[PDB]
């Protein structure tokens, strides 16, 4: 850069009594709407209080790379929707008179959504996979379902998000899903999952029961603990 005639640098001094402080982020200090300080500290309590094993077993979740494999399989076996159930219903009814075809046929395998439908097909030993949303709103809705799956001999896996389990189906959210039957081509793909799912969830179920969470004190509170214990060290 060639020399400019009279262009000045003119810096600024920042500090106590010097020029006025700039406008920078106060993300930690802003008085938040007090409806979130409810929902925010609730994230902290579940880190502090001794969360019991029946609940804490909902943090340990199926990995990502395994999750996409399952979500691939569920993409093949989603239930029918409006606007094509409808058209098939248009195809169903209008063919009854002709005599060549008619309304109903055999039902190819599909998923099953509600916990009140899953369980009723679990204690009959009819469910192959059981997928549990890791964060159901009252967590009492599925706080009993793992220990039921082990006692009946069922592979069960926990996925992240009840909203995308609501995309394997076509509703806002779906607590649970369960495979009861599959077709012969994919039957290879299923056994690839349950051979690794049940090695981490069903097989070491006894490891999960003896587990307790919480007591992870705050970083301000724990850095002090380390510093003072360092002092005795």
């Amino acid at each position: 850069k060639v020399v400019n005639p009279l262009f000045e640098k003119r810096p600024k001094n920042f500090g106590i009594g010097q020029d006025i402080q700039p406008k920078r982020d106060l993300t930690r200090f802003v008085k938040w709407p007090r409806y979130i300080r409810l929902q925010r500290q609730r994230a902290i309590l579940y880190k502090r209080l001794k969360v019991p094993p029946a609940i804490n077993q909902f943090t340990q979740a199926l990995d990502r790379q395994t999750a996409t494999q399952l979500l691939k399989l569920a993409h093949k076996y989603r239930p029918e929707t409006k606007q094509e159930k409808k058209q098939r219903l248009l195809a169903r009814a209008e063919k009854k008179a002709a005599g060549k075809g008619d309304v109903p046929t055999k039902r190819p395998p599909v998923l099953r959504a509600g916990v009140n439908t899953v369980t009723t097909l679990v204690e009959n030993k009819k469910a192959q996979l059981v997928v549990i949303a890791h964060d159901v709103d009252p967590i009492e809705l599925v706080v009993f379902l793992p220990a039921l799956c082990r006692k009946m001999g069922v592979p069960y896996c926990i996925i992240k998000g009840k909203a995308r389990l609501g995309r394997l189906v076509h509703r806002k959210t779906c607590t649970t899903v369960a495979f009861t039957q599959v077709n012969s081509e994919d039957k290879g793909a299923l056994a690839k999952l349950v051979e690794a799912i049940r090695t981490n969830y069903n097989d070491r179920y006894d490891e999960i029961r003896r587990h307790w969470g919480g007591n992870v004190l705050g970083p301000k509170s724990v850095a002090r603990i380390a510093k003072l214990e360092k002092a005795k060290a």
């Binding site: 500090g15 106590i16 009594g17 006025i20 402080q21």
Partner: protein, 244 residues
């Protein structure tokens, strides 16, 4: 009977405070970053008289360091403070009269006034017309300090709470006999409006169980428990002793 005078002094009525003409509160300033680690410099614009108080305040003018305007306070004025003076405020502001700095960074034996109780309440202790709290001996572990309040009771005050140096201006007030009934009247009219007391021994036996009789005599032992119900509790409360 009826409620005695001093039993409706809590009803929140005629016995309120007379605070129409009072200039303002008396608080030092909120603790912020510039005061915690450095020191901020302010002018003493004008010293004024705050009615109902023998300790005249002082309009100190500071500068907000994170916006652009002029902020004003009402410090209790120490003694020696005069207008056009640069009052400092913080942790690294040296010792001199009328210049707040937190107890803990001031040497043992330094006289303070308008001392805070707990860090951040902007001045509560030893701020009458000419009183002063003395610092005694720090304890750089557990971060405490011991002050000798004006009464004489030694307090274990938390450190890091601030106190403007020097005695409070207006001292030596109660050395002039008021000398007049009226001159005491004008004094108590400017404050909570409760001046002319009438002894219990004079009122008929409804108010003040003391009263009544045919000789204007108390009749009852003066000293009273503090479990006594609200309405008998008159006279020398909870007397640990009496007599000269």
């Amino acid at each position: 009977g009826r409620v005695i005078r001093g039993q409706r002094k809590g009803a929140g009525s005629v016995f309120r405070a007379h605070v129409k003409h009072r200039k303002g509160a008396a608080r030092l300033r909120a603790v912020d970053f510039a005061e915690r680690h450095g020191y901020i410099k302010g002018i003493v614009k004008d010293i004024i008289h705050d009615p109902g108080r023998g300790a005249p305040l002082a309009k100190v003018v500071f500068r907000d360091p994170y916006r652009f305007k002029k902020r004003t306070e009402l410090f209790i004025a120490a003694e020696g403070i005069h207008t056009g003076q640069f009052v400092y405020c913080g942790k690294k502001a040296q010792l001199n009269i009328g210049n707040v700095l937190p107890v803990g960074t001031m040497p043992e034996g330094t006289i303070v006034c308008c001392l805070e109780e707990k860090p951040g309440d902007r001045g509560k202790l030893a701020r009458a017309s000419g009183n002063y709290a003395t610092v005694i001996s720090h304890n750089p572990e557990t971060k405490k300090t011991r002050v000798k309040l004006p009464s004489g009771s030694k307090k274990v005050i938390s450190s890091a709470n601030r106190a403007v140096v020097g005695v409070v201006a207006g001292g030596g007030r109660i050395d002039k006999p008021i000398l007049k009934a009226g001159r005491a009247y004008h004094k108590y009219k400017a404050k909570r409006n409760c001046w002319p007391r009438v002894r219990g021994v004079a009122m008929n036996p409804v108010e003040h169980p003391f009263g009544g009789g045919n000789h204007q005599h108390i009749g009852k032992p003066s000293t009273i428990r503090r479990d006594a119900p609200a309405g008998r509790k008159v006279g020398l409360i909870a007397a640990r002793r009496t007599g000269r």
